[PDB]
Symmetry: D2
Subunit: 221 residues, 4 copies
């Protein structure tokens, strides 16, 4: 019943809402974080996920406590500490992709052996951004989608799915921001978590290489 | 608790599977169908949804019994009976869009008054097609996606969502057809239904203008 | 030096502008047209390109005079005379695709034998449209793009390219229509023609399956 | 007649083919490079384009010799020196975006004053890549496209266009590589340069925010 779930970047914001939703549903939830005191209720591993050896030890620790990760949620969104000019910020965007590659590659090893797995990558929450900021956003998301689709092709018929959830504006002047959202409101973080939970369930077993926008119509056209 | 649900094209295949999933979930489910026999257990109206008068009469009958439609599932996929050269088949593509336009426009009246609604459009199951075949498939699916996105923008902030579920290959020589599907198998119709049920749920309230492929990674790249 | 060029729908507007650009460049240019008067200076065949026999006869006549068609420009855009409710207009969308399928399939015979060809499909000029209107537009354009890509894959390495030019707003109240165009003006028809001429040139030999928007940034995002 | 053109990364490969094509056409061509002896025929400025102050001086030097840049070609493709594991390589991908932002922002200042300009961004040549490599590729391209589209919207009706050229495989085992290319061959670098020249010409004045794939059908679907 209860699964071993890992949410990287699950200490705050949408990452935390996702982590809580899995724990509230009865899964065994671990998270990674860089700094601060982590939220209550989780196996929390302080580490830099850009570092192969730190990721190895994180997974060691998680596998020894919860068993091998069956569901990986890689929250690749821009964190607090990170969010500098937009131009220099692309270096932060690159560090988020690199960490994602490493945690996913490490999780795939055990999922391959189990002949079952769920990998869900979460792009950054949308904010108001200049041209270079919008480029960095587009690059970050396409990187996730490109990675997910490649892994789906590479892994083939091993019952491991790879999907991306793309949040829009999320509630964490308000009228001026929502004026570009057809639904005319901010998302609640729980709305993002519900989609993540759906993709991680047996009901989504035939969905792979997909990007699911949870954005109120914002980016549809 | 139970909602008034309408599935157009709901007497067989994916449409029937969708109707059953909402019935199992405790909703009041009506279907329309063009030909054949109705499934047992459902309020069923035989009609040609390309005819505005027949559409109004089907809705009148259904809603007298179940109340105004709160969830509309327009199964626009090519039907058994339709399944001609491709050049002539463009007329069937035309009529499939026409029918979808008529049933959705009718449903939007009550949904707008209720300030809530769910409209999910289902594209055709994928087949092996030549060039004009693939063109007609691309035209049919894009018509649905364009319709859903335009409606999302037009209805704006009235809590009515419009989404498209795009099935891949669905089980309704086999190993040769599914050699192009990364997950290496056909979808069960119930898998399509599970996604439709999720989109119709309150958990998917912020998803609109979206196309969700349930295709095992077939059309991703 | 001079090639045999055919522009279907080439008696007015963008189609005429395209025919003139190839004529100015020194090509032997034929056109087909459904109704109206033919432009002076061109081999012109009055015919209904949805009728296989009429298409064969138009090509027979044209090629006797100019030699086998080496460049086909299929102007599939909604015509003056076509320009109905949107529900009925889906039949015009159907016939516009049908005509395009017939003229291209006919051209491919000689191009395959020659091991060289250029096929450029032109989508409809953009207008202000409601929901089903936008759907029909999206369906028409996607049909062309799907056709071109399928043909590129099917013909493979025979040096025949298939591309789509997608005009935005074209000059054939004004300030209100072009307030959504980032460049802030209408296209001149000659601007559409210049892109078509480039795609037909030997300089565009490696471009195939592409959709090139000439739209002032209108449909980009 | 003769324009001031700058090709960043124009010292080798496709960048050099583009630079030569503009110089052969009679334009005044400057290039930036990091190391090595630059090719003959160009005003060549050794600099790190990730550095705002080095970019400022580069442009100073170019503007004093050739006059303000009227055409900027930003070759954001992965260079020699750069092309490490795919995972660590995303840092290189981020440095390429940052340099692009800076050179474009600097060129926009003079183009805005001239009320005319051409900005063309060139994505990486395609190679055979693992999952993390394909993600890095997708991120790099989407970053360029996202930047171009944002600038097109931001600049509005100032007659400055922003476009992306996406090369496929370019000629700089061969049968196994080309087996995924519909046209069944590598591009010649001159084919990429010809498209760049077209976008930079007055004939492409209504094309902006567009991505033009020069890939033989490779990435069309």
């Amino acid at each position: 019943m209860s699964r071993s779930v890992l949410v990287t970047g699950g200490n705050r914001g949408i990452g935390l809402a996702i982590a809580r939703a899995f724990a509230d549903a009865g899964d065994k939830v671990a998270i990674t974080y860089r700094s601060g005191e982590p939220p209550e209720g989780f196996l929390a591993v302080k580490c830099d996920i850009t570092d192969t050896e730190q990721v190895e030890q994180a997974y060691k620790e998680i596998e020894e406590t919860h068993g091998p990760v069956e569901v990986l949620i890689a929250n690749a969104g821009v964190t607090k500490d990170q969010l500098m000019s937009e131009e220099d910020f692309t270096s932060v965007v690159e560090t988020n992709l690199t960490g994602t590659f490493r945690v996913v590659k490490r999780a795939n090893r055990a999922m391959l052996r189990a002949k079952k797995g769920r990998v869900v990558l979460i792009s950054s929450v949308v904010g108001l951004l200049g041209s270079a900021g919008q480029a960095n956003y587009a690059a970050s998301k396409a990187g996730l989608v490109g990675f997910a689709r490649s892994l789906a092709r590479e892994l083939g018929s091993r019952n491991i799915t790879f999907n991306v959830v793309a949040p829009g504006f999320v509630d964490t002047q308000r009228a001026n921001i929502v004026s570009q959202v057809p639904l005319g409101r901010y998302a609640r973080p729980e709305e993002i978590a519900a989609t993540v939970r759906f993709l991680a369930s047996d009901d989504a077993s035939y969905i792979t290489g997909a990007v699911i926008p949870v954005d109120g119509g914002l980016g549809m056209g």
